[PDB]
Design an enzyme around this catalytic site. Structure first.
Site, PDB file in Angstrom:
ATOM      1  N   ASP A  78     -12.384  55.013 -10.032  1.00 33.84           N
ATOM      2  CA  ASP A  78     -11.238  54.795  -9.155  1.00 33.84           C
ATOM      3  C   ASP A  78      -9.962  55.131  -9.911  1.00 33.84           C
ATOM      4  O   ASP A  78      -9.038  55.726  -9.360  1.00 33.84           O
ATOM      5  CB  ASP A  78     -11.195  53.339  -8.675  1.00 33.84           C
ATOM      6  CG  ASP A  78     -11.288  53.224  -7.166  1.00 33.84           C
ATOM      7  OD1 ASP A  78     -11.181  52.098  -6.636  1.00 33.84           O
ATOM      8  OD2 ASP A  78     -11.473  54.267  -6.504  1.00 33.84           O
TER       9      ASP A  78
ATOM     10  N   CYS B 133     -11.285  67.303  -3.224  1.00 27.46           N
ATOM     11  CA  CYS B 133     -11.251  65.891  -3.606  1.00 27.46           C
ATOM     12  C   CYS B 133     -10.348  65.316  -2.521  1.00 27.46           C
ATOM     13  O   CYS B 133     -10.687  65.415  -1.338  1.00 27.46           O
ATOM     14  CB  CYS B 133     -10.667  65.680  -5.017  1.00 27.46           C
ATOM     15  SG  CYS B 133      -9.340  66.804  -5.558  1.00 27.46           S
TER      16      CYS B 133
ATOM     17  N   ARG C  36      -8.943  66.705  -9.323  1.00 30.12           N
ATOM     18  CA  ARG C  36     -10.350  66.741  -9.706  1.00 30.12           C
ATOM     19  C   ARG C  36     -10.978  68.107  -9.422  1.00 30.12           C
ATOM     20  O   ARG C  36     -11.767  68.609 -10.219  1.00 30.12           O
ATOM     21  CB  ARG C  36     -11.120  65.641  -8.973  1.00 30.12           C
ATOM     22  CG  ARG C  36     -10.577  64.235  -9.213  1.00 30.12           C
ATOM     23  CD  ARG C  36     -11.465  63.182  -8.571  1.00 30.12           C
ATOM     24  NE  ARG C  36     -10.792  61.889  -8.477  1.00 30.12           N
ATOM     25  CZ  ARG C  36     -11.186  60.879  -7.698  1.00 30.12           C
ATOM     26  NH1 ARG C  36     -12.269  60.995  -6.929  1.00 30.12           N
ATOM     27  NH2 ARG C  36     -10.484  59.756  -7.671  1.00 30.12           N
ATOM     28  N   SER C  37     -10.628  68.704  -8.284  1.00 30.34           N
ATOM     29  CA  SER C  37     -11.146  70.019  -7.927  1.00 30.34           C
ATOM     30  C   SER C  37     -10.682  71.012  -8.991  1.00 30.34           C
ATOM     31  O   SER C  37     -11.360  71.999  -9.289  1.00 30.34           O
ATOM     32  CB  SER C  37     -10.618  70.438  -6.556  1.00 30.34           C
ATOM     33  OG  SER C  37     -10.959  69.484  -5.565  1.00 30.34           O
TER      34      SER C  37
ATOM     35  N   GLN D 147      -3.897  67.339 -12.288  1.00 27.97           N
ATOM     36  CA  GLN D 147      -2.711  66.516 -12.060  1.00 27.97           C
ATOM     37  C   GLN D 147      -2.200  65.606 -13.161  1.00 27.97           C
ATOM     38  O   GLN D 147      -1.074  65.122 -13.069  1.00 27.97           O
ATOM     39  CB  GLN D 147      -2.919  65.660 -10.807  1.00 27.97           C
ATOM     40  CG  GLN D 147      -2.609  66.381  -9.521  1.00 27.97           C
ATOM     41  CD  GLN D 147      -1.141  66.750  -9.417  1.00 27.97           C
ATOM     42  OE1 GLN D 147      -0.272  65.877  -9.318  1.00 27.97           O
ATOM     43  NE2 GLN D 147      -0.852  68.048  -9.448  1.00 27.97           N
TER      44      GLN D 147
HETATM   45  C1  LIG Z   1      -5.634  60.789  -4.136  1.00 32.97           C
HETATM   46  C2  LIG Z   1      -4.971  61.079  -5.495  1.00 32.97           C
HETATM   47  C3  LIG Z   1      -4.048  62.300  -5.522  1.00 32.97           C
HETATM   48  C4  LIG Z   1      -2.957  62.503  -4.581  1.00 32.97           C
HETATM   49  C5  LIG Z   1      -2.009  63.680  -4.551  1.00 32.97           C
HETATM   50  C6  LIG Z   1      -0.846  63.598  -3.436  1.00 32.97           C
HETATM   51  C7  LIG Z   1       0.305  62.829  -4.235  1.00 32.97           C
HETATM   52  N1  LIG Z   1       1.120  62.105  -3.280  1.00 32.97           N
HETATM   53  C8  LIG Z   1       1.837  61.792  -2.193  1.00 32.97           C
HETATM   54  C9  LIG Z   1       2.061  62.620  -1.004  1.00 32.97           C
HETATM   55  O1  LIG Z   1       2.103  60.498  -2.210  1.00 32.97           O
HETATM   56  C10 LIG Z   1       0.960  63.435  -5.480  1.00 32.97           C
HETATM   57  O2  LIG Z   1       0.480  62.813  -6.454  1.00 32.97           O
HETATM   58  N2  LIG Z   1       1.902  64.304  -5.427  1.00 32.97           N
HETATM   59  C11 LIG Z   1       2.590  64.730  -6.600  1.00 32.97           C
HETATM   60  C12 LIG Z   1       2.776  66.251  -6.555  1.00 32.97           C
HETATM   61  C13 LIG Z   1       1.440  67.043  -6.627  1.00 32.97           C
HETATM   62  C14 LIG Z   1       1.605  68.580  -6.592  1.00 32.97           C
HETATM   63  C15 LIG Z   1       2.150  69.161  -7.919  1.00 32.97           C
HETATM   64  O3  LIG Z   1       1.787  69.089  -9.091  1.00 32.97           O
HETATM   65  N3  LIG Z   1       3.246  69.834  -7.473  1.00 32.97           N
HETATM   66  C16 LIG Z   1       4.192  70.494  -8.389  1.00 32.97           C
HETATM   67  C17 LIG Z   1       5.285  71.200  -7.566  1.00 32.97           C
HETATM   68  C18 LIG Z   1       4.762  72.375  -6.724  1.00 32.97           C
HETATM   69  S1  LIG Z   1       4.581  73.896  -7.683  1.00 32.97           S
HETATM   70  C19 LIG Z   1       5.413  74.759  -8.714  1.00 32.97           C
HETATM   71  C20 LIG Z   1       4.828  69.447  -9.337  1.00 32.97           C
HETATM   72  O4  LIG Z   1       4.873  69.667 -10.544  1.00 32.97           O
HETATM   73  O5  LIG Z   1       5.259  68.409  -8.893  1.00 32.97           O
HETATM   74  C21 LIG Z   1      -2.247  64.645  -5.569  1.00 32.97           C
HETATM   75  C22 LIG Z   1      -3.317  64.462  -6.491  1.00 32.97           C
HETATM   76  C23 LIG Z   1      -4.217  63.331  -6.512  1.00 32.97           C
HETATM   77  N4  LIG Z   1      -5.234  63.360  -7.511  1.00 32.97           N
HETATM   78  C24 LIG Z   1      -6.305  64.327  -7.388  1.00 32.97           C
HETATM   79  O6  LIG Z   1      -7.153  64.514  -8.277  1.00 32.97           O
HETATM   80  C25 LIG Z   1      -6.469  65.209  -6.111  1.00 32.97           C
HETATM   81  O7  LIG Z   1      -6.939  64.728  -5.077  1.00 32.97           O
HETATM   82  O8  LIG Z   1      -6.118  66.360  -6.128  1.00 32.97           O
HETATM   83  C26 LIG Z   1      -5.118  62.529  -8.658  1.00 32.97           C
HETATM   84  C27 LIG Z   1      -3.828  62.539  -9.310  1.00 32.97           C
HETATM   85  C28 LIG Z   1      -3.553  61.770 -10.452  1.00 32.97           C
HETATM   86  C29 LIG Z   1      -4.548  60.957 -11.019  1.00 32.97           C
HETATM   87  C30 LIG Z   1      -5.828  60.903 -10.436  1.00 32.97           C
HETATM   88  C31 LIG Z   1      -6.170  61.671  -9.266  1.00 32.97           C
HETATM   89  C32 LIG Z   1      -7.592  61.460  -8.793  1.00 32.97           C
HETATM   90  O9  LIG Z   1      -8.017  62.007  -7.828  1.00 32.97           O
HETATM   91  O10 LIG Z   1      -8.385  60.720  -9.376  1.00 32.97           O
END
Ligand SMILES: CCc1cc(C[C@H](NC(C)=O)C(=O)NCCCCC(=O)N[C@@H](CCSC)C(=O)O)ccc1N(C(=O)C(=O)O)c1ccccc1C(=O)O
EC number: 3.1.3.48
Length: 282
Positions: free
Chosen positions: A180, A214, A220-221, A261
């Site tokens: 989790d 995921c 994770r993907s 991430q």
């Molecule tokens: C379910 C977990 C999860 C949610 C989100 C969506 C998230 N939130 C919102 C909408 O509340 C989020 O964490 N967003 C942050 C931005 C993610 C995209 C990213 O990296 N974007 C760039 C910007 C775009 S590109 C140049 C940036 O640096 O911010 C993204 C990733 C994950 N997530 C994943 O593995 C996944 O599902 O992809 C996890 C993230 C951190 C730790 C553990 C996990 C895990 O699954 O165990």
């Protein structure tokens, strides 16, 4: 030697620092189709979208949008489709993509519910006699068999195109033991999971690209695709120690945002590739 490099980052505890350098160097392309109002309900997260340049298009004239990207690894000659965990209303789109892209396998790295909340919709049938039918995309899905194991489960599903009456076998590789919080204790089970998928032939060229997901389909993907490609690269080139994971991760991020991430996930990828090398090497 990535392992030597591994021990240096660990030594000086600079994983968060390194992870950040990657975030800054990562590609930034437009996601205009994703952000259109009509597609609001087709995305699970506001901040996770598919670059237009590499997005997967549904073969329909209506709305061809689905939050999924095609990751093409030219040198490894390997392609993966990364996508978010289907939503209650995008399950038919999800299976339409699988059919249209001619995918052989589906890789799930999460559970429908985690931390007490929904992380993905129940998009496959749980019982043989309870098949599902996606009216919007005219697809029928049937659970044919299921093999439950300690760290993962493999399901044999039959997807039928009701329009043409044509059918296909789809392998559902579902990793059930991802914690989790954080990442896995050891990459051992994750690596075996990966090999099981390879063994099925779902990652092979004679099939459409495999569909991995995921929740957001990036964290994770990301880990899954990065390790596979890296191990493959070490398997191709003559100098397996010439595989730079940070470089490979950045190459993938040209196709979909935020693959991997966290610093934990990044560290884990190293463990996976490293541990995986002592084995895949021979
Ligand atoms: C379910 C977990 C999860 C949610 C989100 C969506 C998230 N939130 C919102 C909408 O509340 C989020 O964490 N967003 C942050 C931005 C993610 C995209 C990213 O990296 N974007 C760039 C910007 C775009 S590109 C140049 C940036 O640096 O911010 C993204 C990733 C994950 N997530 C994943 O593995 C996944 O599902 O992809 C996890 C993230 C951190 C730790 C553990 C996990 C895990 O699954 O165990």
């Amino acid at each position: 030697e990535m392992e030597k490099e591994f021990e240096q980052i660990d030594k000086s505890g600079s994983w968060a620092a390194i992870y950040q350098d990657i975030r800054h160097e990562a590609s930034d392309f437009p996601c205009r189709v994703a952000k259109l109002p009509k597609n609001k309900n087709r995305n699970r997260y506001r901040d996770v979208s598919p670059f237009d340049h590499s997005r997967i298009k549904l073969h329909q004239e209506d709305n061809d949008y689905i939050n999924a990207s095609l990751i093409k690894m030219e040198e490894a000659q390997r392609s993966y489709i990364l996508t978010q965990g289907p939503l209650p209303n995008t399950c038919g789109h999800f299976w339409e993509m699988v059919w249209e892209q001619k995918s052989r396998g589906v890789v799930m790295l999460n559970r429908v519910m985690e931390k007490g909340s929904l992380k993905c919709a129940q998009y496959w049938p749980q019982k043989e006699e309870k098949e599902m039918i996606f009216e919007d995309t005219n697809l029928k899905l049937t659970l044919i068999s299921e093999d439950i194991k300690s760290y993962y489960t493999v399901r044999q599903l039959e997807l039928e195109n009701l329009t043409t009456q044509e059918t296909r076998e789809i392998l559902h590789f579902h990793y059930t033991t991802w914690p989790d919080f954080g990442v896995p204790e050891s990459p051992a089970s994750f690596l075996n999971f990966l090999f099981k998928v390879r063994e099925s032939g779902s990652l092979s060229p004679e099939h459409g690209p495999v569909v991995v997901h995921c929740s957001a389909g990036i964290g994770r993907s990301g880990t899954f695709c990065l390790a596979d490609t890296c191990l493959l690269l070490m398997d191709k080139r003559k100098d397996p120690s010439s595989v730079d994971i940070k470089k490979v991760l950045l190459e993938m991020r040209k196709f979909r945002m935020g693959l991997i991430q966290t610093a934990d996930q990044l560290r884990f990828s190293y463990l996976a590739v490293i541990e995986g090398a002592k084995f895949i090497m021979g």
